[PDB]
Design a protein around this ligand. Structure first.
Ligand code: ADP
Ligand code: ADP
Lengths: 397, 395
DNA sequence: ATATATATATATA
DNA sequence: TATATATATATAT
């Protein structure tokens, strides 16, 4: 485990303007919406790093569709790039309008990881994603999702988000706990992660090797289910508690079908399963559906990623089994419905601005993706290559 | 029989939402509906565990569709998360507005079994599903359904639902009048039930052995139909009345001494894996069961995770008219199982849509939570009473 | 000005 | 490929 200070340090923040500017922008929003058909007063002003949520209290009779279907013209008349209308704030009566600022400060990855949520976290595969709309950091947990879609068009930060997730893995767990599998169909982005002991294979490029890696993941899932069936334990955390107590009790356990040890948590990232499905066919779709159907209790987790938010790629079989979605900036409302079963993803800004959809029944929480760069990535990868030796399992292909 | 005191005790409920706190909400609802186009008057209030139905009488000359289009904004302006406008309360002249409570309240299973409906129930296979939208216990016999599909996404309260159904079997029925075939294609979930005398086998692992057990079940159904045709018997309950004509009333019979033919409830945890791995001959077996087996003595609790045409075709659709649907992720899946819409609107954690046989109208049922410790207690209470009476040649 | 009807657009059996 | 549903648009209110 390298220390957290090997990242780029925190710069000087400059936002959160004088309250006369916030009151002037509140009165400007009231005047512009009054010049349109609606009439609404600004309730409260919440500043933020990138955007500034204006909670406004709609008057009698005015609907929310009459606020959502003129956001284009409101963003034009407020001289900003694009505005976003929150249809529902949880537990209030108002309607959130989020306006970008003049200067747009980035999200610093050390400022994300310097949080007590990440620092005193319980699990072994956390995923620090970035701040909320006001600077409060979001740190999710991949063993609670248990799978993850990522989409959004180019120039929006998909590979930067995947690198933020993978450094969130690599700053906490040893290779005895979180052992990765990386399937990069290009040679472009995820090729930098070579050498670290957290891998199982060299970073898989060709699609026959991708299908072989998914079939080996199916085999690992089946042998872990058979082993936990023999030992009667429902989940992997209880299994590791059992085997740790058995090894510390002086009588370690045995082969159900030698000596067993603590199993790691396999995280299988995929960078473009659009192109993977394109080259191979429906067999990859059936394998991803099988893994997303069964592999929660066996520790196999997925980080999917795709450029195209279309029905050819994110099919219904993938949507029904993976309930946690990340939505970056997409092209239009049809792409937003394909990724989140609802609108609201097209109104973003890009360059690290996502809509985290939490697992289960939920409302999308706007998260700003942490900007992790090639300096930090290369430095932490060389740190792990100097702190450990590579270990590849040969028969995965 | 095991005692009902094995379950966890009914904790004194956090009966929140005082009558002034709901009277103020009703006055606020009629004011915030009068601010929009409609005019309304609140008729009565039914406070409940999870969702609270506000029965409202609309004004003269206003339509339900105005309330339906106005629904999301009404849910926005009342400081709640969602709403659902029931277009028709059966038998009344009102419109049901169901506002979900912000306190998702757990339903303990002893709070469902202790109803007088369940204790005075006579059939061998009751299913304690949970409470209704109003909070009253809903007990539904399995013998009148006659089969039951279960579908819903991962983390919706499905294994807890199958555990509640099987404990509803086990808290009333002896090993004489009920006997379970547990087809568990996942190796992980329902191995906890191993040891009870209510099994015909150790709990089945492989789809090959599961298909062998289903062939055995087809053959047992066929010999039961042939013996009922020999005895001139019009259903299973008529043959248990012939059992009452037998040594139950102290007059023995012959073997054309016929004992009880136990009602078989075949649970399948994931038949999606089976019907995608081994093919469609299993679907031929399931269709030949599900078309005929009501008057036979073999029933199926089918559970899955793919409400799709790849799993649930039209073959296993028209023959199972009683379906449990948990939280699915699309209206397309809702039309795939319930043949209507409204299944993705569920609030998760066992809150299902019991679709009764006959009337094709959904009946929403909150799922009863049963923990794994209560399961170990019931497994212990059955292992301390009876050795496993197997027909071991099923595999 | 705006709820309704309708022609067509995309997703699925 | 035929169709069920969904979305944008005259239209008359
Ligand atoms: N938090 C952020 N702040 C600023 N820029 C960001 C942030 N996150 C991502 N980016 C931008 O996203 C770009 C990477 O996009 P990428 O994921 O490679 O798109 P694709 O993989 O679809 O081609 C980088 O050039 C970077 O400038
Ligand atoms: N009646 C209930 N009340 C509250 N939570 C419930 C209830 N029934 C089930 N659950 C929740 O559902 C979870 C189990 O889901 P499960 O049936 O295992 O889904 P799956 O089988 O798809 O994994 C449990 O963690 C439990 O908390």
């Amino acid at each position: 485990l390298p220390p957290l200070s090997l990242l780029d340090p925190a710069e000087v923040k400059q936002k959160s303007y004088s309250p006369e500017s916030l009151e002037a922008m509140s009165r400007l929003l009231e005047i512009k919406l009054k010049e349109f058909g609606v009439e609404v007063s600004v309730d409260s002003v919440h500043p933020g790093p990138v955007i500034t949520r204006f909670e406004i209290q709609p008057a009698a009779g005015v609907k929310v569709s009459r606020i959502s279907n003129l956001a284009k013209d409101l963003a034009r008349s407020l001289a900003v790039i694009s505005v976003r209308v929150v249809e529902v704030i949880p537990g209030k009566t108002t309607v959130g309008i989020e306006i970008p600022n003049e200067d747009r400060q980035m999200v610093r990855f050390s400022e994300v990881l310097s949080s007590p949520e990440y620092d005193e976290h319980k699990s072994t595969v956390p995923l620090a994603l970035g701040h909320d709309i006001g600077g409060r950091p979001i740190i999710t947990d991949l063993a609670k999702m248990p799978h993850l879609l990522v989409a959004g068009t180019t120039g929006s930060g998909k590979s930067v988000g995947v690198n933020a997730m993978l450094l969130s893995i690599l700053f906490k767990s040893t290779p005895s706990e979180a052992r990765l599998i990386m399937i990069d169909p290009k040679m472009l982005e995820l090729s930098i992660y070579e050498g670290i002991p957290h891998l199982l294979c060299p970073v898989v490029t060709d699609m026959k090797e991708a299908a072989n890696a998914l079939r080996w993941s199916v085999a690992e899932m089946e042998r872990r289910y058979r082993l936990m069936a023999a030992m009667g334990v429902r989940n992997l955390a209880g299994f590791n508690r059992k085997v740790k107590d058995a090894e510390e009790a002086g009588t370690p356990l045995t082969d159900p079908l030698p000596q067993l040890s603590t199993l790691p948590t396999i995280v299988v990232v995929v960078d473009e399963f659009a192109d993977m499905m394109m080259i191979v066919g429906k067999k990859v779709e059936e394998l991803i559906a099988r893994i997303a159907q069964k592999a929660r209790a066996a520790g196999i987790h997925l980080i999917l990623a795709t450029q195209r938010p279309s029905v050819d790629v994110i099919t219904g079989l993938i949507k029904a089994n993976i309930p946690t979605r990340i939505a970056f900036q997409v092209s239009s409302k049809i792409d937003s419905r394909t990724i989140l079963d609802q609108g609201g993803a097209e109104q973003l800004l890009g360059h690290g601005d996502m809509l985290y959809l939490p697992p289960g029944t939920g409302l999308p929480i706007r998260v700003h993706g942490a900007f992790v760069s090639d300096d930090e990535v290369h430095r932490v990868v060389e740190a792990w290559k100097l702190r450990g030796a590579p270990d590849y399992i040969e028969d995965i292909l």
